[PDB]
Nucleic acid binder design. Structure first.
Ligand SMILES: N[C@@H](Cc1c[nH]c[nH+]1)C(=O)O
Ligand SMILES: N[C@@H](Cc1c[nH]c[nH+]1)C(=O)O
Ligand SMILES: N[C@@H](Cc1c[nH]c[nH+]1)C(=O)O
Ligand SMILES: N[C@@H](Cc1c[nH]c[nH+]1)C(=O)O
Ligand SMILES: N[C@@H](Cc1c[nH]c[nH+]1)C(=O)O
Ligand SMILES: N[C@@H](Cc1c[nH]c[nH+]1)C(=O)O
Ligand SMILES: [Mg+2]
Ligand SMILES: [Mg+2]
Ligand SMILES: [Mg+2]
Ligand SMILES: [Mg+2]
Ligand SMILES: [Mg+2]
Ligand SMILES: [Mg+2]
Lengths: 147, 147, 147, 147, 147, 147
RNA sequence: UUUAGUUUUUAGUUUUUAGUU
RNA sequence: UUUAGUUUUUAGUUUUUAGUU
């Protein structure tokens, strides 16, 4: 059972969608035992989006820099979030479109049982469009994985 | 250009993820000229999700009950939101999974230019899982279309 | 090299899109050595579409009733035509949509070299929509395979 | 209801597949109130196909050069047509294939009700193959959207 | 680094493909620390394939019967194996096809480093075809996930 | 009906997975009437994988170097094998991943009936991962087509 | 065709048939 | 979870969290 006060998906999205200039939303999350990182990336290359999220997560200590296990979990969470952003073909520049995104990676246990271990959420919010400023609409995605 | 105070996708999501008893977020949105609809649907059949969103939207007057044009726009917005929810295969029961969702449909012009006309956002949030309570994690999707 | 007078795809489509009450377009094709069949099918189940095309093709002698080889070629041609019709998810009723189609299956060699053997084209034209008459638009697909 | 004499998809395809020198099919269509555009594009990059269709459509006045609304409608119509052409993965050069295409974009109201507004059809026909002349077969795609 | 003698994917496939040496191959794998499960399932419903693998895995103790974490890992491994089997649309009966499969689930650490923890491989081998005996060819899939 | 002793898919995989008995396994297969080709390719570009398999197949005489028919069959077999390898998006470097593969192409008739003609199996085995040695797991794919 | 490989701090312009491993 | 299986002559109505293998 998902713990009602620890919904990692909902929390990662709330964090992304906040613009309160003095927030410390990160501080509260960290106090409650979550590992958190925020970033921004814009590209016509999906691999640049994936790379920014991985590099931010490893530098901020949200996932282990050593070994494959945690990188594997984060890659597949990122892929799942990209589905929401790309909506059928995981392609950007090759389909004459570009994205500008803010992202959040949240790590912790969202369940009632401490046996469920750590899980990870990757959330993405921004715009996708033709490569001409203004010819764009909003885009979102969330991917969740065990870690 | 997207009008900063009129970001239809972000607004539909914030509406979805807020859990206030005396809220009236719907009142304020309608008071800013938005057409708004909230609902809930849980199913192992995608078609039931699509139908709830359509039926809710037509009944609350978010889209026209007559004609195809607006139904067409909402169907494709719904499909796009379902991508984020299903993440690769737009199947539920046939892949031994079930969803419980809250949805929001928001209709209005998110651009600076009045000439961009109305657009529609369909936003979905809930859980997806094995058909056993608790064997689930969060899921999310947003689709945006012109109308 | 494709023979300019034997373009199996273009020919199958021209045949489908003709409504001339007295045509004998089939007779000319057959005189030029093509094997041809025409049919109609409407459904919310893709398997019913596939079945109608196979059963028509086998009854009209466009493909062999015995053995797997030709059935295999026709199945994969049908799948390719369905991509054009479904445009991302090869689902009908589960996504709250229905199709009504006319189809053509053409069999013969469209190349300059007689060594290229027989090929097959499956073409589909009709409407796809919500299950309410009139809430629909046109749909098309063509699949081509060696046989 | 689709108006029998105004089937935008069928009309765009017939325009695409006819090869008359003194034709003026474009003249008759424009004389029935349609906005019409024909072109050719060959590439190993999908983005070049998308761009040719957009650039042709804007230049011939089939869609507005200003604003996003009509560009958005045409992009998604183009994506839908590309499904029929690519049949599973919306990739060309990265999968060692190339396309040579003719395209038609048709704009107008295909319904009985004037209230359905304008719709757009993008139709594509040509060959897809290995990057060696002659190692190819026909390909086809149609996408339809409200505008 | 993958340990040469602990390649979980290759080992799971070898187990599946030997119908000579089953009884003691399982013995040897379990001796080396692997958790192992073998089974067979045939269906026109993907959900029945998924269920057979989960049920066999839990009953034979390859994954925890309690909690979600391990069920989640095995579900996504099974989805990945099913891609190889279905090759683009994760549908069986709805596309007029059926499968008969043998499956293997292997659990253990295939890496040099103990810190990589346990991983799981789901391997599938059999036939997919029209629902007429003999109108079929072979099919294979392997999915690998961290657990 | 598939002939028990001529299962082209299973045979191609066994060939790939034995790094003990290569030299004379090829000899034995060729003795039994099979056309056989083995190779290796590593890349962040799918098109390089496709090309290596085609080039090896044509050079070793597994398929005709002349004409399109056999090239077409092998291309679609390779596409099917790649589904198992890529598991939902047929992309490598654009999704920040790389593969190192061994491959086998087998050609012959796996059925009881001579009338089924020749079929072709493309089998792939190796690793897919981040572009950092060791950050990888195993991958497999098999595609089967008539030729 | 003869096993691949290094990553963060919001992106961006476009027509007239393509092509070798 | 203890290997699946038969096919043509244009389709069709929909909200208030789902669930066992
Ligand atoms: N609207 C597109 C993005 C785009 C490309 N070109 C114009 N718009 C999408 O939904 O992804
Ligand atoms: N975890 C699956 C849902 C699920 C099915 N079975 C168990 N869980 C998903 O991401 O969609
Ligand atoms: N317009 C949908 C069909 C549809 C379903 N509901 C309404 N229309 C399509 O493009 O396939
Ligand atoms: N036949 C492929 C095109 C191709 C690539 N290489 C050879 N032919 C298709 O159907 O798209
Ligand atoms: N050939 C199909 C299976 C099939 C369906 N009908 C006939 N055969 C596949 O590759 O999945
Ligand atoms: N794990 C990925 C490969 C990968 C990319 N980055 C890290 N690993 C897959 O399953 O394809
Ligand atoms: Mg992986
Ligand atoms: Mg549509
Ligand atoms: Mg097949
Ligand atoms: Mg869009
Ligand atoms: Mg999941
Ligand atoms: Mg082809």
């Amino acid at each position: 059972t998902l713990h009602k006060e620890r919904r990692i998906g909902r929390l990662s999205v709330l964090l992304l969608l906040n613009e309160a200039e003095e927030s410390t939303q990160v501080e509260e999350l960290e106090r409650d035992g979550w590992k958190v990182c925020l970033g921004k990336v814009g590209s016509m290359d999906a691999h640049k989006v994936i790379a920014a999220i991985e590099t931010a997560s490893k530098k901020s200590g949200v996932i282990q820099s050593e070994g494959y296990r945690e990188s594997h979990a984060l890659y597949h969470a990122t892929m799942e979030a990209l589905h929401g952003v790309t909506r059928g073909e995981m392609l950007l520049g090759s389909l004459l479109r570009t994205v500008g995104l803010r992202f959040a990676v949240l790590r912790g246990n969202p369940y009632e049982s401490e046996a469920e271990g750590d899980w990870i959420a990757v959330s993405l919010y921004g715009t996708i469009g033709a490569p001409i400023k203004g010819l764009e609409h909003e885009t979102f995605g969330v991917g969740i994985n065990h870690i």
